[PDB]
């Protein structure tokens, strides 16, 4: 005979898996007692987490957009329809002009389903810092012909002229805008002009700034791109989920009353990528986050994110640090550590030992040997930190890098040699204690408060 | 001004989103009051669901197997390490011979990352029913040179000679075993022999049967496949996650001596490169719980019961005269042939759904000739053989009404739908199915007296 | 200053290049004093050679089919038009139904231009013994997805059923019939039926049997194939040139009055393959050979070729030798030497040392280790040999293989070991002398006779 | 009954095919009585033509470089060996450092076989004006990932910085130098530097200039390219044949030490695999004659004269005010810019042709802006600088009439053609061009008193 159902299936994690329960609890405290500046990270709501960790995880569905609303799909169909319309609402889209598929598992498979839908294998692709196909060679560089466009070597802004030169020569079927680690806004108009001239589709991956986009705090790629993709856990502050927006209806002139043919191509491609159906709990959670993202409180959050990023950059620069483009217009700063005589690996490893989490990051000129760190505001803004709080974060960064330099001097620049300085280091423990003392002062979303 | 953090971020879903909260309750009730026969569906444990809706959803990780065990990764690396070692334990794998990557988002990205690791674009691939309409034309068929092998069109078993025939002519770089609707065990020995005569890598997508593999209730693909992939929510009863197993260590005996398997780094890189923004660490944690639960004698008994329920449901259906593909089952599913009755899968799937019996139409033109039915979900609710025979009776009742609407209201898909309206018989069978479903326990929520 | 024009440009080969003049003269005598049974070889006419070695070699042309007939192209345009219409005539084609491009350099680039015209890279291809991509891996196996069909393992005939099984499963865009070394005719009807069912184009490479096709001595692939390609020096007995025939005009039903779109696609593809224009001397020579091929004398030649192949096979089999399919219906026999305990390399190398030229050839079951020889009648038929003359050739083959066996016994089966027996071998010199004595008895086309 | 062998096979073309024989005579006369300025055309020697129309056309060869030197291949292997050694001698190549394959049918199959040897499908390729309409979209652009580099749009010279720019961004596996209508020498040193910074193979299609390379009248691509391909009928004055040169032996100094070039076998295999039915051994023999003739001081003086005739023609044209691309020439051709006069290439090419001056329209929309003009053919007939200045005058006369039909009969391609009918001026210039052309010797036939 079987075990009783409750013994395995209705008992708490603390009873079933004490080891995992303990590590989750330890990671819970670590998120609270530290400064999370990873740009793609956020802290989502308890309400999202409840939809995420619910019986929606048990519901299979075909993987095409639900249209039945009856039978066994009565409820996921309304959930998904609420997700779609909240999606269109949060990004201020006309549903007669824009459709949204909310079935992809994540952003990356959402992108690759989008590419699969509108392109053939080996069709030529351009995106920011998109490898030709160690760093990251995605499916997009392997199965398509990728050529990157690049930021201006000196100013850090996208060379929109070299991009047009590149597009007219290379002739991509598709141009991808919306790379990561870019601290300025995108001239989507120029991207449309450029795509029109070379006959390319224009896709935006707004994964990073989807929250800022939703709050109308940055340029909207929907105004000029044919397709928009995103993940939903970054600045949007939702689950780790994916969505694909595509144009619907009449095309702008070019042509005898022709209409966008995106919907069916995209639906089939996501459907075909969904062995076993979607993560319907992710769709349920996403709908929650989209409703939240349409609130006044979120518009203000997004404003504060930008303002925190700006204040952090101004602090860092006043101490003499090099920020790519010399500032930011979105949620992140890109910090060129090479002028200091530092690599991102050292700064990220020393920060990490002090309960500051940042991402080492390639900066204009690198060759896995990154000379920068990427620094995001959304996570700590969601804990309610304001500009003065991000100035103190800047000081912590100052101390961290000051400490990295001091360790590097006494122990050497080679990474393994530098490593001996992180062992039993008083200044590391002191800085970490200050970070934990500081971080504990702020609230934390994601769990129940009476 | 920003909303207080507690207002938007610490307030329960019932308050923040009553609309979604209501729909989740309604769906929660629907899962309790119906018969879930979708072969890929299961009902996972509350403990899995707790690890899933946890602060691991906020944790970024680079997407490479974690080995730091310090700093911001100290805990997920420990969780991830518990996942890997528990994956290896649950499938009885020596760690010196098998490694596992627990980082893919889901089954299909896991597969395609495995294929991307060991193959190049346009490399030749063979899989069951794998296309080269209603069906999935997936990335595997689009970026690789793919050709199916099929079941013997009259026995419904895999035609192993015709497979070696095609494999020797086609020369696939990779052969994939495992199938969504195959009611019989696989001859992984025979596949390995075929793989070696044509120089192929051998990969098993064990997603549907991984629970049975873990319980050693079906053959283990690990004895003969180079790579085994899985999604984890089917018979393994875990989260919707992904996993890639690969061989490590020295290879078997026209190759160099002292040679070793070269899978780990390419697979790791391929998974890492497919993870823009990191893995779902909440899925890795939840899956580590599921793997621990899979390694228990209670789970072995669950898997035995799944097979026996599938068989008992099978014997019932053919006891009434229906045709099962291969005339029975060796795993968690039955594949019911509706052509001898003259009905399509889409018809029986629709009427069943109206009675809170969920099944999937299934190939056996582009019109589905059968119906796929699985035991894992209902077996998870505690059902045993006689209960599945009651399900058989419900299915017999269900299909008898479908033949009564067909032979009366018409056989066209137009004329047939007109008969499922205010249909007394569909109402009463729905009611009986509902009454029956509520009799059984349901995993997924925390019992009141464990809350302490 | 320059040399006088005549000194380099109007002097004979014997004066300019005595070494080459001598070797050409030596090769001239070798062709006369030997038995050439290479199936793809022929001896073309003096008239073809005069058009081949003429001032047409100096004429550049664009590489699209000539339509001007005025100006600098006045004459190549009529030459090429004479070539096209003689082409259509020699293969009994309706010009409203069939077009012919006569610009390809050779058969292989003609094939690959044909494939390039009607297919995209990686489109799936089937042909007889077509490798999937050492033997021969052509551009067709490298740039397309090739799957072969195969002869029946026991009978040597094409498995037309396994072919249909293969076509319906593999779904090629194009099926190629007309492999080489196949000694029977082709059921082009079944090939059309099979191509119709899998939606494939049907192309025939008749390089080998184009002469027999022209004389209506074998099945005509034009009756069922969409495209026919050929080289022109084999059974057609012309220059080494290429041609591509394609259907023109209405398609058979399937569809609202749709017409074949082959002409422009093929013209452009050959044009694009012709860096520097065509070999206009090859077009001039080809036109000569096509006129010759439409004569009664050629119809009889083609008949005698078949009859010589048959008589040679019957002789070989009566001595107990294994012929694939046990006979022939065209110009060649395929001789399976494995039952004798011999490889094609030994038989071809010993034959070659006796002024018999044959091609070692893979036979059903080989793995560059060929167990057969390919044997063609067209060359020696063109010297006027008849059935009794080919029976004597069979005897020479008998003696040759009898000698190979005897050498292999005394010196071993390993090729290098066998090789020591060909050194200073009386029976080899005797057999060679008999071959030269026999071969000298027959006339030779290709040079001027008063 | 079979025709006697002498009747069809030993009877001259004048008897067997009077129609073709007549047309060849007429074309023979046309070549003598006009001005041939097609840059790729030459007039080859009678000795080449004898080796070409010879019994080598019947000889089959397997398509691998011949090394038997016995049996049925004893003589072509000796001929082929004379071809290879003479190819190496004519381009001043050490045999220990350079091998050559003389078996491709023609230039374009030679190129594509070279690319197939060292590349894989979709590998990235850069060449001059190489596309990714009126122009050739060839197999190189279709099966490989191709991108052009261009001349500087204002100087007409290769923009070497913009080429290294693209090469470092694009990362071509292969860069191709050589161009059909470039009037200047190539910086093969600069190409090699570019090749090495981006990790490319470097290949020169030297077809247009191989005669000059052999004479050492332009830079040698062999000093810096890994592979050099050529067709042989242009400035080399040979048959229409093909040839692939490749580096052999140790490589130059981030690579292994003692490393050697690995080109020979892959190229041989690629050429062999492209030769269904064997090579054109009559072309290999004829080419061996051409290579011998190229290795002589008389040929060096011919090549010097070709360059000087091109220059002298260039100075003449701009002496009258016309625009040459790059304002002159360093090789065998001039590239005449017709846009400052307001005419298209197609217009001047048509009118010229009507006067027995053959030129090619040439890029400098999809409408040809210029005209390509080469010195090799006319220089082969014995013409020197003042004769080419008379050609310049004929071209000035020719283009002046084209501007007189344009500005009068209309500038549209419709209105322009109406003006080239019974046109007195075109008749008289044709006549003068004809009278002038007949003044010069013509190679290709056997002088009466060498017939002994």
- SS3 per residue for chain D: CCCCHHHHHCCCHHHHCHHHHHHHHHHHHHHHCCEECCCCCCCCCHHHHHHHCCHHHHCCCCCCCCCCCCHHHHHHHHHHHHHHHHHHHHCCCCCCCEEEECCCCCHHHHHHHHHHHHCCCCCEEEEECCCCCCCCCCHHHHHCEEEEECECCCCCCECHHHHHHHHHHHCCCEEEECCCCCCCCCCHHHHHHHHHHHCCEEEEECCCCHHHHHHCCCCCHHHCCCEEEEECCCCCCCCCCEEEEEECCECCCCCCCCCECCCHHHHHHHHHHCCCCCCCHHHHHHHHHHHHHHCCHHHHHHHHHHHHHHHHHHHHHHHCCCEEHHHCCCCCEEEEECHHHCCCHHHHHHHHHHCCEECEEECCCCCCCEEEEECHHHHHCCCCHHHHHHHHHHHHHHHHHHHHHHHHHCCCHHHHHCCCCCCHHHHHHHHHHHHHHCCCCCCCCCCHHHCC
Distances from the Cα of B389 to the Cαs of B309, B333, C174, C388, in angstroms? Answer: 8, 14, 53, 83
Q: Which contiguous run of DSSP H or E holds residue A310?
A: helix A296-318
The domain over range C52-293 is classified in CATH as 3.40.640.10: yes
Q: Contact at 8 Å (CB) between B405 and B351?
A: yes
Query: What is the distance between the alpha carbons of residues C73 and C76, in angstroms, rounded to a whole number?
Result: 6
DSSP annotation of A153: T
Between chains, do A300 and B3 touch, taking CB under 8 Å as contact? yes
Q: Which fold has domain C305-439?
A: 3.90.1150
Q: Could you say which of D58, D231, D240 has the minimum Cβ distance to residue C57?
A: D240
Strand D370-374 to strand D201-205: parallel, antiparallel, or no bridges (unpaired)?
unpaired
Positions of D marked active-site: 60, 62, 205, 231, 234, 240
How far apart are the C-alpha atoms of B11 and A291, rounded to whole Å? Answer: 14
Residue B105 has φ and ψ, to the nearest 5°, of -60, -40
Asked if A356 and A34 count as a contact pair (C-beta separation under 8 A), the reply is yes
What is the nearest CA distance from A120 to chain D, expressed in angstroms? 14
Where along chain A do the CATH 3.90.1150.10 domains lie? Answer: 304-439
CB of C82 within 8 A of CB of C286? no
Which residues of C are catalytic, by number? 60, 62, 205, 231, 234, 240
Answer whether C13's CB lies under 8 Å from D451's CB. Answer: no
**Chain C residues within an 8 Å CB radius of D282:** 52, 240
Contact yes or no for D335/D374 (Cβ under 8 A): no
DSSP C322: E
For residues C172 and C176, what is the distance between their CA atoms, to the nearest angstrom? 10
By three-state DSSP, how is residue C299 classified?
helix
User: Are A74 and B451 an interchain contact pair (Cβ–Cβ within 8 Å)?
Assistant: no
Q: What count of Cα atoms within 13 Å lies in the side-chain half-sphere of residue D33? A: 16
Q: Is B240 considered catalytic here?
A: yes
What CATH architecture is D52-294?
3-Layer(aba) Sandwich (3.40)
Distance from CA of B34 to the nearest CA of A (A): 9
Nearest Cα neighbor of C51 from D31, D25, D282, D236 is D25
The chain B residue lying nearest A109, using CA atoms, is B109
DSSP H stretches of helix in A95-159: 107-118, 139-142
| B402/B411 Cα distance (integer angstroms) | 10
**Residue B156, min C-alpha distance to chain C (Å):** 18
Report the distance separating Cα D15 and Cα A118, nearest Å: 63
3-class DSSP state of B159: coil
CA distance C302 to D130: 46
**Is A231 designated active site?**
yes
| Closest CA–CA distance from residue B328 to any residue of chain A (Å) | 23
User: Helix count (H) and strand count (E) of chain A?
Assistant: 18, 13
Report resolution in angstroms: 2.2
When computed from its CA atoms, the radius of gyration of chain A, rounded to whole angstroms, is: 23
Q: Do C59 and D275 touch (CB under 8 A)?
A: no
Measured between beta carbons, which residues in chain B are less than 8 angstroms from residue C166?
A: 169
CA of A192 to nearest chain D CA: how many angstroms apart? 22
Run of H or E residues at B213 = helix B210-215
Residues of B in Cβ contact (< 8 Å) with A446: 9-10, 55, 58
- A287-to-A291, B418, D123, D171, D396 alpha-carbon distances in Å: 6, 35, 45, 44, 77
From-to residues of CATH 3.90.1150.10 in chain B? 305-437
Are C145 and B147 an interchain contact pair (Cβ–Cβ within 8 Å)?
A: no
| Nearest CB to D446; choose among C12, C19, C276 | C12
* CATH 3.40.640.10 domain range(s) in chain B: 52-294
Cβ-based neighbours of C86, under 8 Å, separated by 6 or more:
C287, C290, C291, C294
Identify whether the C-beta of residue A235 lies closer than 8 Å to the C-beta of residue A331: yes
* Alpha carbon distance, N-terminus to C-terminus of chain A: 42
Exposed e or buried b per residue across A232-269, where buried means at least 16 C-beta atoms within 10 angstroms of its C-beta: bbbbbbbbbbbbbbbbbeeeeeeeeeeebebbebbbbb
- CATH number of A304-439, picked from 3.90.1150.10, 3.40.50.300, 2.60.40.420, 3.40.50.2000: 3.90.1150.10
The candidate with the shortest Cα–Cα distance to B268, out of B277, B259, B255, B279, is B279
CA atoms within 13 A on the CB side of C296: 3
Chain D residues close to A145, C-beta within 8 Å: 122, 145
Residue B46: which of A285, A288, A15, A450 has the closest Cα? A15
Using the beta-carbon criterion (under 8 Å), do B45 and A16 form an inter-chain contact? Answer: yes
Angle at alpha carbon of residue C330, lines to C326 and C333, rounded to 5°: 45
H-helix or E-strand spanning residue B372: strand B370-374
Strands D242-247 vs D98-101: parallel, antiparallel or unpaired: antiparallel
The experimental technique used to determine this model is X-ray
DSSP string over B3-20:
PPHHHHHSS-HHHH-HHH
- DSSP structural state of residue C276: T
**Residue A22: is it exposed, middle or buried by C-beta count within 10 angstroms (0-12/13-18/19+)?**
middle
3-state class of C190 per DSSP? Answer: helix
Q: Which residues contact A368 (CB under 8 A, 6 or more apart)?
A: A134, A135
- Output B316-324 pairs: Cβ under 8 A, ≥24 positions apart: B316/B388, B316/B389, B316/B392, B316/B393, B316/B396, B317/B392, B317/B395, B317/B396, B320/B392, B320/B396, B322/B396, B322/B399, B324/B183
The shortest CB-CB distance from B2 to any of A79, A108, A297 is to: A297
- Give the full edge-to-edge strand order of the sheet including A174-177: A98-101, A242-247, A227-231, A201-205, A174-177, A124-128, A145-149
CB contact under 8 A, D49 and C54: yes
What is the spatial distance between Cα D202 and Cα D225, in angstroms, rounded to a whole number? 5
Question: Taking Cα atoms as reference points, which of C59, C82, C87, C86 lies closest to residue C71?
Answer: C59
Interstrand relation of D201-205 and D227-231 (parallel, antiparallel or unpaired)? parallel
According to CATH, where is 3.40.640.10 located in chain C? 52-293
Contact C281, C56 (CB under 8 A): yes
CA distances from A41 to B80, B277, C239 (A): 19, 8, 73
The residues near A132 (Cβ < 8 Å, ≥ 6 apart) are A141, A146, A147, A148, D124, D170, D171
Closest partner residue to D170 (CB to CB) among A122, A147, A171 is A147
Q: In chain C, which residues fall in CATH 3.90.1150.10?
A: 305-439
CATH class, domain B305-437, is alpha beta
- Pairwise CB contact (< 8 Å): D171 & A132: yes
Closest to D132 (Cβ–Cβ): which among A132, A166, A171? A171
Q: CA dihedral in degrees (B23, B28, B33, B35; nearest 10)? A: 110
Q: Which residues of C touch D40 (CB under 8 A)?
A: 60, 276-277
Closest CA to C158 of C137, C141, C178: C178
Please say whether the dihedral angle defined by the alpha carbons of residues C304, C310, C311 and C312, taken in this order, is positive or negative: positive
- Distance (Å, whole) CA B88 – CA B94: 7
A240 catalytic residue (yes or no): yes
Q: In what order do the strands lie in the sheet with D323-324?
A: D323-324, D333-337, D370-374, D360-362
DSSP 8-state secondary structure symbol assigned to residue B40: T
CB nearest C147 (choices: B122, B148, B170): B170
Q: Which residues of B touch C170 (CB under 8 A)?
A: 132, 147
Greatest CA separation for chain A: 73
Chains A & B: contacts with CB separation below 8 Å: 394
Query: Alpha-carbon distance C15 to C155, whole Å?
Result: 56
Q: Could you tell me if D308 and D341 are in contact, meaning their C-beta atoms sit under 8 angstroms apart? A: no
Distance CA A226, CA C134 (A): 50
The sign one gets for the Cα dihedral D437, D443, D444, D450 is: positive
Position of tokens 């899978």?
Answer: B263
The closest of A146, A180, A140, A141 to A166, measured between CA atoms, is A146
DSSP B227-293: EEEEESSSTT---S-EEEEEE-SBPP----TT-B---HHHHHHHHHHT-TT---HHHHHHHHHHHHH
User: A127 in helix, strand or coil?
Assistant: strand
Distance from the B170 Cα atom to the nearest Cα atom in chain C, whole angstroms: 7
Taking an 8 Å Cβ-Cβ cutoff, which residues of chain B contact chain C?
122, 124, 132, 145, 147-148, 166, 169-171
Q: Is C127 helix (H, G, I), strand (E, B) or coil?
A: strand
Closest to A147 in 3D by CA, of B269, D121, D146, D120: D146
């Amino acid at each position: 005979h079987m075990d009783p159902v409750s013994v395995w299936g209705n008992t708490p994690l603390a009873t079933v898996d004490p080891e995992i329960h303990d590590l989750i609890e330890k990671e819970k405290r670590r998120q609270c007692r530290g400064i999370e500046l990873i740009a793609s990270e956020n802290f989502t709501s308890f309400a999202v987490i409840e939809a995420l960790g619910s019986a929606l995880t048990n519901k299979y569905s075909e993987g095409m957009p639900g249209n039945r609303y009856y039978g066994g799909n009565e409820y996921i169909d309304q959930i998904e329809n609420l997700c779609r319309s909240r999606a269109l609402q949060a990004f201020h889209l006309d549903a007669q002009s824009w459709g949204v598929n909310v079935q992809p598992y994540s952003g990356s498979p959402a992108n690759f389903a989008a590419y699969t839908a509108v392109l053939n294998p080996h069709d030529r692709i351009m995106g920011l810092d998109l490898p030709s196909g160690g760093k990251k060679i995605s499916a997009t560089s392997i199965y398509f012909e990728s050529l990157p466009y690049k930021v201006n070597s000196t100013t850090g802004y996208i060379d929109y002229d070299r991009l047009e030169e590149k597009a007219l020569d290379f002739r991509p079927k598709l141009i991808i805008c919306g790379g990561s680690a870019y601290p300025r806004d995108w001239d989507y108009k120029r991207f449309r002009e450029v795509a029109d001239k070379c006959g390319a589709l224009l896709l935006c991956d707004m994964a990073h700034t989807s929250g800022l986009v939703a709050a109308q705090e940055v340029n909207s790629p929907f105004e000029y791109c044919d397709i928009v993709t995103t993940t939903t856990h970054k600045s949007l502050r939702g689950p780790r989920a994916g969505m694909i927006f595509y144009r619907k209806g009449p095309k702008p002139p070019k042509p005898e009353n022709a209409v966008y043919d995106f919907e069916d191509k995209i639906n089939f491609a996501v459907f075909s990528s969904l062995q076993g159906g979607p993560h319907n709990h992710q769709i349920g959670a996403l709908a929650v986050a989209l409703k939240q993202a349409a609130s006044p409180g979120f518009k203000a959050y997004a404003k504060q994110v930008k303002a925190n990023a700006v204040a952090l950059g101004k602090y860092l620069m006043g101490k003499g640090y090099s920020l790519v483009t010399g500032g930011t217009e979105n949620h992140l700063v890109l910090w060129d550590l090479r002028p200091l005589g530092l690599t991102g690996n050292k700064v990220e490893k020393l920060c990490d030992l002090c309960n500051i989490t940042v991402n080492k990051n390639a900066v204009f000129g690198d060759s896995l040997a990154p000379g920068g760190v990427r620094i995001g505001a959304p996570a700590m803004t969601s804990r309610g930190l304001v500009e003065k709080d991000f100035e103190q974060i800047g000081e912590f960064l100052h101390r961290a890098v000051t400490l990295t330099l001091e360790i590097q001097k006494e122990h050497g620049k080679l990474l393994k040699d530098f490593n001996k300085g992180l062992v039993n280091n008083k200044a590391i423990e002191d800085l970490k204690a200050d970070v934990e003392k500081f971080s504990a002062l702020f609230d934390m979303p994601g769990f129940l408060v009476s």
